[PDB]
């Protein structure tokens, strides 16, 4: 039931997810860092990469980890 389907430390990878009027929107950024321990105190703006017409009442999320 892939009823909707779509295909396409030293760096900080950032994302923003929101879900409005049946569209799930993804913004993102990749940037280098020097504080290996934590988020940098400077400024940069994320930019849109995806918009998914998926129509789901999302209330929870989880994240996926690679195992050897």
């Amino acid at each position: 039931n892939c009823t909707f389907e779509y295909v396409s430390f030293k760096n900080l990878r950032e994302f923003v997810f929101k879900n409005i009027d049946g569209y799930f929107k993804i913004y993102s950024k990749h940037t280098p860092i020097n504080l290996v321990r934590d988020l940098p105190q400077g400024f940069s703006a994320l930019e849109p990469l995806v918009d998914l017409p998926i129509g789901i009442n999302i209330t929870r999320f989880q994240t996926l980890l690679a195992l050897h």
Partner: peptide
């Protein structure tokens, strides 16, 4: 008769219980 056509935020989808076939 045909009973294959059925009813129960903007553009949300949702695939006693609210199933009603039209006749």
């Amino acid at each position: 008769g045909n009973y294959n056509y059925l009813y129960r935020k903007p553009f949300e989808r949702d695939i006693y219980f609210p199933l009603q076939s039209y006749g």
